[PDB]
Point group: C3
Chain length 324, copies 3
Amino acid sequence: FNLRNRNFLKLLDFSTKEIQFLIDLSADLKKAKYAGTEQKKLLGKNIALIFEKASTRTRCAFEVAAFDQGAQVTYIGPSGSQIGDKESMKDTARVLGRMYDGIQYRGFGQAIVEELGAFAGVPVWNGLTDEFHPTQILADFLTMLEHSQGKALADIQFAYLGDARNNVGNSLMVGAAKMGMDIRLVGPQAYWPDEELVAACQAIAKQTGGKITLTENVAEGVQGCDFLYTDVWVWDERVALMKPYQVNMNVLKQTGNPNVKFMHCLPAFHNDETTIGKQVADKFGMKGLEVTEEVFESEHSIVFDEAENRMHTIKAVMVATLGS
Amino acid sequence: NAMAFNLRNRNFLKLLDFSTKEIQFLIDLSADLKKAKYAGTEQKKLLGKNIALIFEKASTRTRCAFEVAAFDQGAQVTYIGPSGSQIGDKESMKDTARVLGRMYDGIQYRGFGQAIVEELGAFAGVPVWNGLTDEFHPTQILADFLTMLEHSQGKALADIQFAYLGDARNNVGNSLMVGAAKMGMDIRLVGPQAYWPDEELVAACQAIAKQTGGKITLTENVAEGVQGCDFLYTDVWVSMGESPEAWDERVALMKPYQVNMNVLKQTGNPNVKFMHCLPAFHNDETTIGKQVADKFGMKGLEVTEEVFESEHSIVFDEAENRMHTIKAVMVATLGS
Amino acid sequence: FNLRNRNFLKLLDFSTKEIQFLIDLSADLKKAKYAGTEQKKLLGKNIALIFEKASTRTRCAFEVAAFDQGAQVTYIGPSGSQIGDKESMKDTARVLGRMYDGIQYRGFGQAIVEELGAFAGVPVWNGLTDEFHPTQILADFLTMLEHSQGKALADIQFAYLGDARNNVGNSLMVGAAKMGMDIRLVGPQAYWPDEELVAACQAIAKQTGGKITLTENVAEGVQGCDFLYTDVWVAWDERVALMKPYQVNMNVLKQTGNPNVKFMHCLPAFHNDETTIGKQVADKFGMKGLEVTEEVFESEHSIVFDEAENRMHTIKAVMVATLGS
Ligand SMILES: NC(=[NH2+])NCCC[C@H](N)C(=O)O
Ligand SMILES: [Cl-]
Ligand SMILES: [Cl-]
Ligand SMILES: [Cl-]
Ligand SMILES: [Cl-]
């Protein structure tokens, strides 16, 4: 079975087995690249990559995945896009859909990409919107499976620390619900995900055997976790509020799990080697913000495997929807 | 096969640089490449060729059409955007042309004066293709003529009658007039006299038309202009690199030439089709189109939503044909 | 004999024979492309081109060379958010190194590219930093060889006129010392290269048979030269008055006493009124052309477009040598 010709707009649109299939495909494509046996399933296909806001990481993952599979790409960056100011999205979708075989869109509201998905007539893939970051969560779930000693996703427990009211938190929560996982959102109540979405995901989790806990208590939130995940907190008010949710070595110890792994979608502020991270940390007497250098660079840290897996999972999305 | 040989290594700077039969050859070639692509039998004639795409203005259709065409034909591309170049600021176009010509096998240029692209064409040493200037947009019109043929069962171009409404002296108007003269068509340019093409260009086209059996009418009278037309064509009333303050004094002047359902009815032709080079301002789903239309109490500018989305509209077929026709130009001039 | 897996960060990192090898490979690749016999050694490789500062010239040479060799490229152009603002270079290098097979960097301090080179895990190539422009000098040396009536580099004498205190002057001086050449830096004393780099190059030149001369005297500086080289001079008002005596004009060519002397320039050049900037500057001083006159630039002595073409072939050599298989 396949997702041939589907769009990839948000994980809400997919079943448990369909998400698993994409992850399994990602693993097979990864192995094949490393083994030099990769079969080009997108040979002769042309893809357009529309970025209304810069996202070099997502961009590079799409380009490399396309190139590996025999496709060619057109990158349209923030200044290149005429959409919404000079040309409607409906018109733009119909035009691009005539010339290209598939289209990636990274932008603002989910409603924009849904309209592209409705009008383009070829597969449309969401590289990130305000609401959702579905490609990231695929990469994360693949990374979890690679680092969990054969535990399936439904047997995994993880915590996301800090500000969960944003695309990454939203997508982790949906993904966890879908896959029957036990997720804890650990952070200040004001920054828990949207109540409507939580309610929807709780409904999903009840059918899949998943669990969703929202808590301000770090000890309770991380106890027993296989993975700990965080992201940047964006600052005076936010830092003071978020500071207790910093992932440091003590937090790892509080899991009680010597095999705990640490994940971060990146970029991370973990030391004074960025302009911004130094500015903030100095103003606040910190060394690293959402995560400490010690944790970020430890053997528990799997962030660069997670980063690499952006590419393999985006490759799976394109192959599944557009490959032949 | 003189024709094919005679196209090799040419620049594609304006349709004034091509014969009737050459234009027909490129259109036919476009149709052949369109069929082959759909059939999955396309033979790559630009394998190993590298093409530079210089864009001094914004583009969606023309950029993507060059990229896709190049990719389909085995070529690779380097896109240099409006922030990327600055030509003439730090480096002369003569120098830039000579440098790019040593590295690349073909160059596309979209920008300002026709003189600039002609200088590029003179100095590069490889084929240079005009993807739009202030004065001309020749690839557009190849796509438009292919679309007209495809939507005129039986008819050749010399049998077709069409009207262009609006700003007749913009690049698209100019090119449509040239193209119609070259192909023996009956073209009406319908819009205010202040925006008619340059009298020297008109004279040149009228001379061409007399030998092909074409007809060129410039008129401010909508009914005389559209009566009997097979196709009605328009474009946005202010062009790129005109300043946005031009809208203020152009909308009211151009408003009588809006393509609405009533204009279609005035052709007297129930099978009239509508064309537009795109982008179009036909509703409130763009910030600029809403703001301008609202300033005049309009809904849609040069074309109404009703027309644009009707069964008479063939704009997305026209847009797709941008790629097949660009492909033809590159294959003819650089292919082997 | 190979450079497989090496970075190409600066000519200081290479031996005389390694530089010669790269130049010979550039020549071979050039001949192969013209002959239609090129063999693709980067087939299937993906390369990232990071340009923190624009250069359409260097960019196009990397792209075309990658394309000819079967590679695919991702061009990442200049923005408000530079490497090190939001993400460390160490993190960026590691991520890009997992996705790509090779990485070009053009940007700011040499330290940045050295860090990228240390962390990426794949070959890293310097397309220009504040300190060094190594790919340019390889192109220049190939061009010199091609236009030298049978002479090797060690046999060549050349002068660089004007402002030498910058990446091009620095690289030309290193390159010349490495290859045993006789280089004259001809210009006002305040614009000679960094004194520490001069000292280091004088030490290299002593091992290779090279010669480095710094002088303000044009006649003495250009006497006997096979090539004359310059670059743009733009504190715009004060520089131009200082630099004006070092304009390459026909009289300077004649002062070499060499009727076969050739003129080189890394480009872009201000040689007339057909650029906004060149016209704006020249007009203040009643000049037509700044560092070079139109007459010299467009003359039969000028080899600037051969030099420009050679940016591609030499960049191709660097990628093939380090990443090819
Ligand atoms: N991206 C665009 N606005 N394209 C329209 C191109 C044709 C139009 N007459 C122009 O020169 O502006
Ligand atoms: Cl990103
Ligand atoms: Cl999602
Ligand atoms: Cl034309
Ligand atoms: Cl160097």
